[PDB]
């Protein structure tokens, strides 16, 4: 057969549209950049797919996890008295928790994506 | 203008087809039956945006086993089951939310008319068999 540039595969994977969304942290995976990381897979109400990298070791680590925990808290889950950080308690705790999320567009290397940027509180979600 | 019947629209409420599906427990709602049994109503969202429901009834002989089946399915989708007494309580209500499961849809009869209904929660093995 004469070669013919094939059509792009998985063009119709559901991604989040711009704005705020009620989502679930469907999955959590361990990763490494040097930096220790949790990869958070996010699932939308219409099976939209997004990801968020929680990076440990830096200055924003504590705050970034707090917002996640507050968003979980505001989706009707009690935050226990655990030492939250790069540990197994946290890894397990984040799996299958409802959240509010913010989705903005993000340029990288020419093309544009829809990136999950922040985890929102009840108040910040209701604003939008 | 003279009347012409508009074509049937699409159900934005797309129901589950028959057979087996992977889904997530999207929502849990506190209810009470007509008899007076406490109930959890589980909204299930399939991978193709299908939407079904399930009534977990407490205070009968089928309650304890029904939870095992749900909690086993949650366990096999990679979530550790905590050390709590499961029942009509905050800890159960909160835990079930947001969890991936395997379900089995079948034909049932509501007031005589047939409908697609979520019947069982499958372990990993059972899912693959289908
Ligand atoms: K029409």
Numbering used by the authors:
A (entry chain A): 1 to 33, 36 to 130
B (entry chain B): 1 to 130
Paper text:
We solved the crystal structure of apo PrgE to 2.7 Å, using the AlphaFold2 model of PrgE as a template for molecular replacement. The asymmetric unit contained two copies of the protein in the space group P212121. Both copies were modeled from residues 1–130, with residues 34 and 35 missing in loop 1 of chain A. For both chains, the remaining C-terminal part (residues 131–144) is missing in the density. Two PrgE molecules are found in the asymmetric unit of the crystal, potentially showing a dimeric form of PrgE when it is not bound to any nucleic acid. PISA analysis shows that this dimer has an interface area of 680 Å2, with 9 H-bonds and three salt bridges. The overarching fold of the protein corresponds to an oligosaccharide/oligonucleotide-binding (OB) fold, characterized by five beta-strands that form a beta-barrel with a 1-2-3-5-4-1 topology, which is only partially closed between strands 3 and 5. PrgE also has a 42-residue-long region between strands 3 and 4 that forms two alpha-helices of which the first seemingly contributes to the opening in the barrel between strands 3 and 5. The apo structure overall aligns very well with the predicted AlphaFold2 model of PrgE, having an RMSD of 0.48 Å over 113 residues.
